[PDB]
Design a protein around this ligand. Sequence first.
Ligand SMILES: Cc1[nH]c(/C=C2\C(=O)Nc3ccc(F)cc32)c(C)c1C(=O)NCCN1CCCC1
Ligand SMILES: Cc1[nH]c(/C=C2\C(=O)Nc3ccc(F)cc32)c(C)c1C(=O)NCCN1CCCC1
Lengths: 681, 688
Amino acid sequence: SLEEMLTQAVQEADIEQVRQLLERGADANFQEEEWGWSPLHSAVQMDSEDLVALLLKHGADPCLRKRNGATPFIIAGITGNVRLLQLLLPNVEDVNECDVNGFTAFMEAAVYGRVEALRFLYENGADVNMHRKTKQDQERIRKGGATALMDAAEKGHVGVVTILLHAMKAEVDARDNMGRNALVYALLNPDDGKAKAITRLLLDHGADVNVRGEGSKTPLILAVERKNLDLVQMLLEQEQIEVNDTDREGKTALLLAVELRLEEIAKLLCHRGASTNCGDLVAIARRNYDSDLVKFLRLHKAGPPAENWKPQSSRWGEALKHLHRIWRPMIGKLKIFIDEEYKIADTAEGGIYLGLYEDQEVAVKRFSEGSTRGQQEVSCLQSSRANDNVVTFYGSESDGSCLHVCLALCEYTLQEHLANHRGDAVPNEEDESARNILSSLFKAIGELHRSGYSHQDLQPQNILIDSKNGTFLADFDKSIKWAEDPQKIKRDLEALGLLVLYVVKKGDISFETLKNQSFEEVIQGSPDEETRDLIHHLFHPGDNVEDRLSSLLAHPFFWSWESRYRTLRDVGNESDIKTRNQNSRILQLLQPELSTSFAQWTTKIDSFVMEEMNALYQDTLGDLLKFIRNLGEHINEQKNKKMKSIIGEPSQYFQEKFPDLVMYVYTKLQNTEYMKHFPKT
Amino acid sequence: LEEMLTQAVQEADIEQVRQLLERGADANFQEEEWGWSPLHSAVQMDSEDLVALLLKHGADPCLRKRNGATPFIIAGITGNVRLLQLLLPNVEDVNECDVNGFTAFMEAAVYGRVEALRFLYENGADVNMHRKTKQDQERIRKGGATALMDAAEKGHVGVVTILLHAMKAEVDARDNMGRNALVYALLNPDDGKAKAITRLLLDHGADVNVRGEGSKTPLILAVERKNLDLVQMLLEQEQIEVNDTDREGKTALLLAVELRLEEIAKLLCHRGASTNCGDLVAIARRNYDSDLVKFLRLHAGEDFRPPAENWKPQSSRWGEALKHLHRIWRPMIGKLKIFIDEEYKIADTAEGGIYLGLYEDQEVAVKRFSEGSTRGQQEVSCLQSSRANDNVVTFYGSESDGSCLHVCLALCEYTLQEHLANHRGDAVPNEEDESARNILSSLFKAIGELHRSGYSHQDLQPQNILIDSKNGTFLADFDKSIKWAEDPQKIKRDLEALGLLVLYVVKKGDISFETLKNQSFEEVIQGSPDEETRDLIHHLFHPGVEDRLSSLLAHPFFWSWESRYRTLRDVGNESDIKTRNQNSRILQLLQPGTSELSTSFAQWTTKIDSFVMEEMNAGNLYQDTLGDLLKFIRNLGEHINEQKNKKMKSIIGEPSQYFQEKFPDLVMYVYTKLQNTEYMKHFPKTHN
Ligand SMILES: Cc1[nH]c(/C=C2\C(=O)Nc3ccc(F)cc32)c(C)c1C(=O)NCCN1CCCC1
Ligand SMILES: Cc1[nH]c(/C=C2\C(=O)Nc3ccc(F)cc32)c(C)c1C(=O)NCCN1CCCC1
């Protein structure tokens, strides 16, 4: 708290207080730990020589380095007051001392366009053609190696560039580690005037014009993309320039000029040997409605690639092949055309259209760029990237006024998918597919809740099936961060219960019908007790922060018919069931209501089968599980083949005859030691 | 073959056009892709001669192509007015539209065709008409723009002042988004043309507190453009609100300070801009903007609080560093926030290293390459084709600056190597290793799906495998990957590295990976602790030939110990095993020939404790056949827990572990004998 007010005093520029505290013993080489700023560093930055003098009076080191390795000498280059540089030079071991990224005081004078300061340092031994030596991580990615001229050229300081080349013997064709010269730095400056002057200077000194910058672009290409005919003329004056150089994308300087609607620039390029075998220029000019340029390319005319690209979607394959072939302007990384041929579906605002994002096929959901709906969709999607059962999110792109959200393209909606597979199974077979779809949804919605989000509009058109029969949740425009109202999670759970019934009924019942039913009507329409119990627990959940849904994945609804039969057999093999030990812990657990279908169960079984098993079966639950265990073990023997014919497949037998059995046993043993007999879930 | 009907019109030789008309050829024929008529194409090329010849052979001048454009409206762009006068006698309405709402008048406004614009004006063209578009694009508030808005955007100064002063153009007409011509004007790259147009629109009363994209006002747009002049012209209005904010919450002054523009900052303060929209002095100080810091100091951020840190990381290993990176100030590289400093460094690479980052405010790992790097290009190519692969590290995106490719990936806790070290103590010496199975089955799926996607990894090792906070395994690092279609045989080296990884993970990391790569295939197999592992690794070193991986997920290596025991019990309960019917199909599968020699279960009745062997005896005596051992296992399984057999239960312990240790080859033997038979039914259900 003493050095603290020394620091505070220097920023307010209260000079007496600075003297007082140095007299009082305040450390002038105190470095704040976040970024390493010294009071001498901060003094040079604010340009107050009075403060620079008083601190130096009290032994403050002028080559003390902050986090980036900069000394208050190097910071003086940035300030560009020469009398500060005078005051510190007597103490500085090397005038070419650099920071961790290789910046010297002379470079910093070049960067900040400090003419008076760069002269001073020039006379005092500064290296003019110094390249920046940086840390090893940065050099292995070929960063660094820039020079004072490149910095001056990029920031457009014409004053500084002139002096460097003429007065200071600056190398014009010095390169950085990536291979760039000052010419390419010069051509990236937004101001046309300053760019024009600097390129002229650099050219006359012998700056190479066949060099490669970002995107493998040449100087000429950069000048064309800038739309500046002047810089094109200057670079065309050199004859050893390669006019038919191509960037990373395979585009040539002429091609871009035609594409960019630049008549003057196009003609001038042709009249300097630019080949017209780079692309179909007249189609491009025709598309741009430049009649005059079409004529020119035609009057100069004397007399296409191969289409590699293949879509992975088979439903959308032919339309994507078309969209890939046509020309469209890019919206960032997105290629899209708003036409019914490329439309997937209709929405509350904008529609779903096929698109290409980074040349990958996607579904593009459109919103107005201001839309609250568009904001919640993107916010929820960007938190869901680890949720395997949520549709993959590529990215969002905006133009003037439309937010495009790009998503993984799926084959079918849940509804369509159920329709296509509706004739696959015979009427009364076990429905594995309903389990897979629903367990996927439970995980999807459960993970979304752990993410802090609730969907708020779960229905079969928001659920998509990919080429490999995976189920994915989509459409988060009405989603909410559920901490805002934790009780609206129940709406997700209710829609899940309707989706349970919807999928179990193979889509024969519409979702609209099901939403118009009451809870009791939904339970009645359920074909079995497992489904009934599950839907019940979704409408009457417990209380959980996205733990609830994963728990219900252990519910016997998601147990196969073999696993259900296996659990009843395993329970019926407990010692105390076979010995009918009625004080036992197991039988006390199955102790007890509403007349179950297995009360008086020995009467409901075929009398031949009942007779032969007896080799004393009472109407207890314990005795029925023993019955199931025994039959399970001996059903396949030669001795029992008539029994086997009457029973058929045993799992289905007991379940049809006693529909509440599995659920009853599950409820009695669910939080007990005998849970171990349940299938692994 | 009549493809000259329109090849002739584009070559503009009229000799072949007139003669083509009387040679079995139509004039209103529309090519199906875009709908271009020869009359459409004639007007676009500005040929008075071709439009004349075709129209005196009946060609309809209100014929539409795909966007609903007529040859009339497309005359609006070309601007030639005597083609407009040749076609007007044949057109019902001069305000006719294309599907996007565009008139012949606005296309004249867009292309700055002054002489064409006034022709249409005095022929009744509506100057204040807004575009009526398709219902899709109106529901996202697109369309509704004016001829003035088009003139303003394209910078045509001539056209703007004629519209305002000759043609009674509404200056504050809005589009469906809520924009006026002022905001269209300020998006124009040319400073001069922008200056002139803004002046005109301002003097006629164009609202200056409008909102465009991003909820930016005209003033904010002028500051972001770095143009002092447009700023002064805007603040000449007194009704303007200088403290209007954008959607990001920032105001015109704050941006000016952030952007290093003391000119514009000072002028803004001198016109009522509040100085508590941000800590301006800290911002100017960080920009080394000495004179600006002095200025703001004389007046600044005394009454301003920066929002309290309402952001929490999900990673616990990297939590502390991400909290710091969220707090500090950094410039954005597109959607990426990163700082290259050792505090935020995750690992070293051969190019650039791995650093913590924030991408769309999500924590990520940022792998850096040279923007030219071939290895950087293969990494993103393979990542972009793996977005559906659940067991590949999630790919957020790539960002480039001047000269560095940043690849942003899901942040994981630990490397496979680190993870096996931390959990080395978790299992008891002789208990089942579930974790080895989960890790390996995830890798099998990962590499399998990567192959279906057309890629091979080519450098599988434990440093390229990451574990997340929920113990899920993810494959990463595809800088050396290849499209295997060029050379389909090189996926075998992925399957070899998988073989090594199997042994590596089963040994809980105690044998190094370098050791294992220096071993031969036979040495690796002999180092395996059980026959399941041995068999699996064998099938990875000798695979082929393609989707071996998916099939191997059914291998008994991935069967739990309960399931292994369950299938031995279920095979042992077959009728023909209990009756010892040796002619049966099952026992002909199991124990055919002269005998079952050279296996730990030859004379198996001798290897079992004599108490338990005795008490199991109720022919009629367990023989040294495999059939009788599975019967043995079935019988014990059913009665082991009964009160009468408590002592047997204590000698045996957990029965699955018992039989596997005393007969290590048993499970694999039964598997091999029954694997493509009907008795496959007894195997556990595996992955679909
Ligand atoms: C309402 C609907 N949504 C979708 C699809 C998506 C949807 O709503 N969101 C999506 C996000 C990504 C993606 F790949 C697809 C969708 C479809 C294909 C449909 C649909 O079914 N469209 C009409 C064709 N069928 C359904 C009724 C009879 C006609
Ligand atoms: C070699 C290595 N790679 C990583 C991490 C990743 C890695 O190599 N690739 C990744 C991609 C995504 C991601 F989230 C993480 C990585 C770490 C943390 C390490 C590591 O172990 N760093 C500390 C080095 N210490 C640990 C043992 C002695 C060296």
